[PDB]
Enzyme design. Structure first.
Site, short mmCIF file in Angstrom:
data_model
loop_
_atom_site.label_atom_id
_atom_site.label_comp_id
_atom_site.label_asym_id
_atom_site.label_seq_id
_atom_site.Cartn_x
_atom_site.Cartn_y
_atom_site.Cartn_z
N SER A 58 0.90 -1.19 0.00
CA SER A 58 0.00 0.00 0.00
C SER A 58 0.93 1.22 0.00
CB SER A 58 -0.98 0.00 1.22
OG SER A 58 -2.16 0.77 0.88
N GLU A 112 -9.49 -4.39 -4.14
CA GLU A 112 -8.76 -3.30 -3.50
C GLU A 112 -9.65 -2.18 -3.00
OE1 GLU A 112 -4.72 -4.80 -4.05
OE2 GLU A 112 -5.50 -3.15 -2.84
N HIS A 172 -7.69 -5.86 0.23
CA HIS A 172 -6.49 -5.07 0.47
C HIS A 172 -5.86 -5.42 1.81
CE1 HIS A 172 -4.44 -1.37 2.02
NE2 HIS A 172 -3.93 -1.38 0.80
#
Ligand code: E2W
Ligand code: E2W
Ligand code: NAG
Ligand code: NAG
Ligand code: NAG
Ligand code: NAG
Ligand code: NAG
Ligand code: NAG
Ligand code: CL
Ligand code: CL
Ligand code: CL
Ligand code: CL
Ligand code: CL
Ligand code: CL
Ligand code: CL
Ligand code: CL
Ligand code: CL
Ligand code: CL
Ligand code: CL
Ligand code: CL
Lengths: 532, 532
Positions: free
Chosen positions: A197, A324, A437
């Site tokens: 990330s 995501e 995610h």
């Protein structure tokens, strides 16, 4: 004894640590900078002054000052990401897991945590590198860096708060690994930096920034890229948010010196309380203090650097998770809830669209909705939910990364690309969020190997596969073991554009990851907005 | 005797005609207007002056003056559409097939041929109404009308060449049916007008024009609509092409009177030779002299009439063929050939795109190609060929009609919608052209019923099904026989939007015909062009 190590900054003493019916060595909380406290708040970090004596390196350090998620108090799904140590501006420390007996020169891996540049900790349970150090015989480092205003307040033209300092925090960590990891048995010539990330964006930013390229060998990017729309702001926009932050705190706003002196006076939690009020009413998928395109750390625009080859040429391994967008929507979009299936009306789909593209003419809104709507079935609450989840993920993560991949591969020395789409058997978030995610990290760190963590045997084998890919790539620049005949993970080339699926089924190879949507996001939509 | 009929214009004598082991009556070549020759070229038609004696009505009349396809000399596939009689400006005649014995008051069907308003004949073999008159016990009329410049030269503000006169040719035919069909055994209260392509556009234009609505009961539109982009031009554009036509023929161009006197002097083939040179370099899918939005025949714009309900409210039955673009591309696009599979490179696909949308900014071009390109497989010659075929058909036929259908159904008294997708077993055009524009007509007219025409037994049954649908709809306004239990062809409603497949398999019902593409064509693309 192997728990004592002498370094160019002083002696440090670690602790023996059990791990899967064996033991290794850990050195927790080594300082790599001067504590950025007081009138050093917002400044570039200084190197840690060398010390006399032995530094107790047996316990985790503090975490940095940051916002703390309280949306679901006691919920492990959200709280496993919160600070698990006392918070402090004195937080610039790294941690090292060293195999036993101490190696002489083995490959090194430096973990850079995510959290949108507004949060994160190196001490989280999912970041515990002992399983990876022990299983793959690597030297595992995790660094830390200032987040929020403390790490990214950007008043360009000033030397007391220039911006990007949390990136300089990471850089100093890497410089210290370059200088001292040989004493821990690590090869400073084979350092792989990796992160997820915001950390994945950081890795890419160190590939781009000249003052960073020489401090590591290759790179892994998970669910993040340096060109992500949330990952950087302009110098003008960074100054705006910095002044807007002063307004929130009754600060004198006439000069940079007076702005900064006021902000340095406030206790850290005062800054954090109003942090989110500086965002433009433009909303939702953006974080306040992020890196700035300043001309120093980034010589030019990221897009021009990418087009011109102005970046470190090496090997990279990167990829995304199937879903995501899930967290963006859960926390910020109307009509999504942790405890419902979050089916979404036509109306709510159209409002989430508008939230997903900040500042888009209406013609752009129709473009997005036309592209993601099934007009044979346009009132299906589940398709509307999944469509919005794809919009958010494509825009903010997958398609930036696919742009990065293609731009990088023209000049680099080897690209490997993965699509991770196994939902953990024991995931506590609702099913509708999908392969979320952040939920490949536990596999990269070998947590399935711990039986009391309640993973399936297939998830242990997938974690072993993944850890071996990561480490073999870090040692050699190729995830495949040379003469071991299992299916090969093929190079990603501009022509073939191959990638693999990462899940519990036997590997499969595909081509042109989400190319249909990313042509829309990376080529068509920006042209449409430019010409209206 | 039943071959003699007295009419408000005179006596006419037909001929007995064999048809599938029986006989019926035919009256071929009845005049319905004064011959539009000489100084009456380009003028509104006058009614046929009544005559003494018996009019021999036993042989086909002339066809009107028109361009003649010579791209494939001797090829039956193309030549079955060319004039099969001597050509002349004296061509305003109709033909009538009457069951034997003569009925007293049975339903009437008036065929309006297509041909892009530049060509067509009522005497073609596929238009021979004897099979339909005999099989369904209807009175079958086919009319004729001036095409090309002779029927659609438009110099607005002038009374010697006002435009739309070929539409007034059709109208006069319908007025004559209203006045005289009772003597042939036809019920002038149950007249259904039907036609294909330009004829389908005509039918819709008579539904729209107030001076036409009262002359028929209901309507069938095949592969054509009044809002089709090739079916009408503005008053300005019609004047431009008319003056441009004078330039091609060395005409005095100072006034309308002098322009028109020159054009009236040229022999008809002189006008036809240069007819195609007046089109804007804007190209390919457009025909020269079409109806004009003049304020008289069409009170306002077609779109405003459609939105306001300003049109005849009745029942309509309409539909399209699966592959409407094939002929447009074969004749005019680079890389398509009658005798190859016409696989199409990426390059040629992009040039056919530009040809398919005349005058579109480049941003619009990308919009079209993004919508019709499979980016996982973007160099597939067959997908590129099929994609271009869909672009051309969606744009010029299917999506205009779907717009018409939806606008009409809000105000009408019943809509039935079909998707015809059976390729005739004996079709002589190449396979890649698919279910071609125009090749449902032979089923509507019952040619499969003639064994020596080499159709499969299934095609005889499908033709019988179709003829019965058309005629039952014409008699009652519903294609389904009341208390006969076979699968029902459902009404098309704004909510459900149901249609049926017309082919040799058992009927299936679907919903929202090509809605994905037509949202793009009918809603998104025009907005994009408007706002750039
Ligand atoms: O995603 N929406 C989140 C959200 N939380 C809340 C709860 C209270 C704190 C506000 N903190 C915020 C957080 C996050 N994103 C933000 C984006 C825009 C803004 Cl003004 C604030 C944000 C994402 C990570 C967690 C916190 C209220 C509104 C809201 O929008
Ligand atoms: O579709 N292209 C056709 C095509 N044929 C030719 C052959 C010679 C006659 C030109 N007659 C034309 C015909 C048709 N469309 C036309 C559109 C634009 C223009 Cl300038 C002429 C057209 C469609 C129906 C048949 C004739 C040359 C160029 C060409 O483009
Ligand atoms: C640091 O080391 C001492 C012994 O070396 C240990 O007992 C102590 O617990 C460590 N620090 C803390 C805060 O526990
Ligand atoms: C990487 O670089 C070496 C030498 O610079 C070259 O021989 C090799 O083929 C390169 N590999 C790739 C995948 O570009
Ligand atoms: C493993 O599963 C059991 C059964 O629900 C549960 O009670 C236990 O807490 C789980 N262990 C962990 C560490 O989550
Ligand atoms: C018109 O009718 C006569 C007999 O009534 C027929 O012999 C003649 O052939 C017909 N006209 C033509 C041009 O053949
Ligand atoms: C058609 O009109 C009649 C009376 O005007 C009405 O009763 C009937 O329901 C209508 N049918 C449709 C399909 O609109
Ligand atoms: C019917 O098929 C035969 C066999 O090819 C062919 O020779 C004949 O011409 C066809 N008949 C017609 C009317 O096309
Ligand atoms: Cl050593
Ligand atoms: Cl303070
Ligand atoms: Cl790209
Ligand atoms: Cl799986
Ligand atoms: Cl899902
Ligand atoms: Cl691509
Ligand atoms: Cl009678
Ligand atoms: Cl003449
Ligand atoms: Cl529409
Ligand atoms: Cl079929
Ligand atoms: Cl086909
Ligand atoms: Cl619709």
């Amino acid at each position: 004894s192997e728990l004592l190590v002498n370094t160019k900054s002083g002696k440090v003493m670690g602790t023996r640590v059990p791990v899967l019916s064996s033991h290794i060595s850990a050195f927790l909380g080594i300082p790599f900078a001067e504590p950025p406290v007081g009138n050093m708040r917002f400044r570039r970090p200084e190197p840690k002054k060398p010390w006399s004596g032995v530094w107790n390196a047996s316990t985790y350090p503090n975490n940095c000052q940051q916002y703390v998620d309280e949306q679901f108090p006691g919920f492990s799904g959200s709280e496993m990401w919160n600070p698990n140590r006392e918070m402090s501006e004195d937080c610039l420390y790294l941690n090292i897991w060293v195999p036993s007996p101490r190696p002489k020169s083995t490959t090194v891996m430096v973990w850079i945590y995510g959290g949108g540049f507004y949060s994160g900790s190196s001490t989280l349970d999912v970041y515990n590198g002992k399983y990876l150090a022990y299983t793959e015989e690597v030297v595992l480092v995790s660094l830390s860096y200032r987040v929020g205003a403390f790490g990214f307040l950007a008043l360009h033209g000033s030397q007391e708060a220039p911006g990007n300092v949390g990136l300089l925090d990471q850089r100093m960590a890497l410089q210290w690994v370059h200088d001292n990891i040989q004493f821990f048995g690590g090869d400073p010539k084979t350092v792989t930096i990796f992160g997820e990330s915001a950390g994945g964006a950081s890795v890419g930013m160190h590939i781009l920034s000249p003052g960073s390229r020489d401090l590591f060998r290759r790179a892994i990017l998970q669910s993040g890229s340096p060109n992500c729309p949330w990952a950087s702001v302009s110098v003008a926009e960074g100054r705006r948010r910095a002044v807007e932050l002063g307004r929130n705190l009754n600060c004198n706003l006439n000069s940079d010196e007076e702005l900064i002196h006021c902000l340095r006076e406030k206790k850290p939690q005062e800054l954090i309380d109003v942090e989110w009020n500086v965002l433009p009413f433009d909303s939702i998928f953006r974080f306040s203090f992020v890196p700035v395109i300043d001309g120093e750390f980034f010589p030019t625009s990221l897009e021009s650097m990418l087009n011109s080859g102005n970046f470190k040429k090496t090997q990279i391994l990167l990829g995304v998770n199937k879903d995501e967008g899930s967290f963006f929507l859960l926390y910020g979009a109307p009509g999504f809830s942790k405890d419902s299936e979050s089916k979404i009306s036509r109306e709510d789909f159209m409002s989430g669209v508008k939230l997903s593209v900040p500042h888009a003419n209406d013609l752009g809104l129709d473009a997005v909705t036309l592209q993601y709507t099934d007009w044979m079935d346009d009132n299906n609450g589940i398709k509307n939910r999944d469509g919005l989840d794809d919009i958010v993920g494509d825009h903010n993560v997958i398609c930036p990364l696919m742009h990065f991949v293609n731009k990088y591969t023209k000049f680099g020395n080897g690209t490997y690309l993965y699509f991770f789409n196994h939902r953990a058997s024991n995931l506590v978030w609702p099913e509708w969020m999908g392969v979320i995610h952040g939920y490949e990290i536990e596999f990269v760190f070998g947590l399935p190997l711990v039986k009391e963590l309640n993973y399936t045997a297939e998830e242990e084998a997938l974690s072993r596969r993944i850890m071996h890919y990561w480490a073999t790539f870090a040692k050699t620049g190729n995830p495949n073991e040379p003469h071991s005949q299992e299916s090969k993970w093929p190079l990603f080339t501009t022509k073939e554009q191959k990638f693999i699926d990462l899940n519990t089924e036997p590997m499969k190879v595909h081509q042109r990851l989400r190319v249909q949507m990313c042509v829309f996001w990376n080529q068509f939509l920006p042209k449409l907005l430019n010409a209206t």
